[PDB]
Amino acid sequence: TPAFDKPKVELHVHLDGAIKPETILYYGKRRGIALPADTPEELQNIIGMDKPLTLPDFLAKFDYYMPAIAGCRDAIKRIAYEFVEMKAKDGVVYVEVRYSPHLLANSKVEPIPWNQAEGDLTPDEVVSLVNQGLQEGERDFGVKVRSILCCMRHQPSWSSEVVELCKKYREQTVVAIDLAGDETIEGSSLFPGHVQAYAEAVKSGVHRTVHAGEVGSANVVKEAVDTLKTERLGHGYHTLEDTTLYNRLRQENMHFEICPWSSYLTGAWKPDTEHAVIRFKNDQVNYSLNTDDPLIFKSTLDTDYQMTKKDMGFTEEEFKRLNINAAKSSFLPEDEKKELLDLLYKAYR
Numbered sequence: 001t002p003a004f005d006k007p008k009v010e011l012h013v014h015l016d017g018a019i020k021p022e023t024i025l026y027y028g029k030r031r032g033i034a035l036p037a038d039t040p041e042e043l044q045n046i047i048g049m050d051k052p053l054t055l056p057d058f059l060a061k062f063d064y065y066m067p068a069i070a071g072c073r074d075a076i077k078r079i080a081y082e083f084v085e086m087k088a089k090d091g092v093v094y095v096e097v098r099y100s101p102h103l104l105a106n107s108k109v110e111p112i113p114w115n116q117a118e119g120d121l122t123p124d125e126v127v128s129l130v131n132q133g134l135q136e137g138e139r140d141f142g143v144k145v146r147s148i149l150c151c152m153r154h155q156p157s158w159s160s161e162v163v164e165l166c167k168k169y170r171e172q173t174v175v176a177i178d179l180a181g182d183e184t185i186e187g188s189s190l191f192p193g194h195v196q197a198y199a200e201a202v203k204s205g206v207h208r209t210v211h212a213g214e215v216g217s218a219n220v221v222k223e224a225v226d227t228l229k230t231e232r233l234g235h236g237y238h239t240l241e242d243t244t245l246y247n248r249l250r251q252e253n254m255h256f257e258i259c260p261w262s263s264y265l266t267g268a269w270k271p272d273t274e275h276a277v278i279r280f281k282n283d284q285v286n287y288s289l290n291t292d293d294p295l296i297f298k299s300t301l302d303t304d305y306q307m308t309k310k311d312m313g314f315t316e317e318e319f320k321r322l323n324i325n326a327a328k329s330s331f332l333p334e335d336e337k338k339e340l341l342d343l344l345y346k347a348y349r
């Protein structure tokens, strides 16, 4: 039985980490692309994980299935559409899905990703394709959907395209910019290509979020907040190692996109310490619960709610509260943000 059987709001989930094994297998076979297994069940076992992995072991997971979807228009649009259906089964009423448009392209994209051969799908089209999938999905399944394009910490040369992409496709599902990738890459937060892109995001009113504090120190979080001027933090668990940064962030009602289950499987969180979210709760912090990558973590939104309910004493009043904050922190136009809030209020009370 669902841990929290009411409407939910999800702000931190990767499109390329939320694909149906079947769909991966389908395109794998239909377009001759080598694939570990050939049975959906076995496929999820190899792609899924249940024990922390090194960055490399983890990254490798993508080389596995990405070549199957990347470059194929049909597949890009489809996984987008199928992702909305997955969310509907979760009882999610609003969701912000993110992904790197360059990682699904095989044209333009400088270092062509996944040892993919030069193709015809550019990053710009990837975005428009995804927009349609997400849009038809919203129509058919009843879930409000917005998207966020990610910049990659190791490739600042893409960041400007990313912000221009968010600018060119706004309203049209794209509501913000993000920064994902290796946090340990020394100085990555300050790469001129990244800071300029977020600076442009500010000049153009493009909402900002950043993956910081998941593995890197509190300083990675600081740079995210003070230099990139982020409005939301992806994870941000290590913020707690700097009480003044933490106190200030609490002061400014900063939003933390928490991924409980995710943190446990990646090692970002060691089961010997009290999970960072438990203190966020005790501190009445502005945060939300997210799946991050259902595919790799073999989960569903419930997985995370089950985890905090069972192992962290999370009440219902808390679930409703954190979801209310998720709505309040959404990148939706105030206009539509109020409408989401009324939905949840009348549904929670």
Ligand SMILES: CCCCCC[C@H]([C@H](C)O)n1cnc2c(N)ncnc21
Residues within 6 Å of the ligand: 014, 015, 016, 017, 058, 059, 062, 098, 099, 100, 103, 150, 180, 181, 182, 292, 293
């Ligand atoms: C090692 C990551 C390289 C390929 C990234 C694909 C994808 C994007 C950025 O949505 N992504 C999905 N989940 C991700 C995660 N937890 N951390 C970084 N990137 C992630």
Ligand SMILES: [Zn+2]
Residues within 6 Å of the ligand: 012, 014, 180, 211, 234, 292
């Ligand atoms: Zn993430």
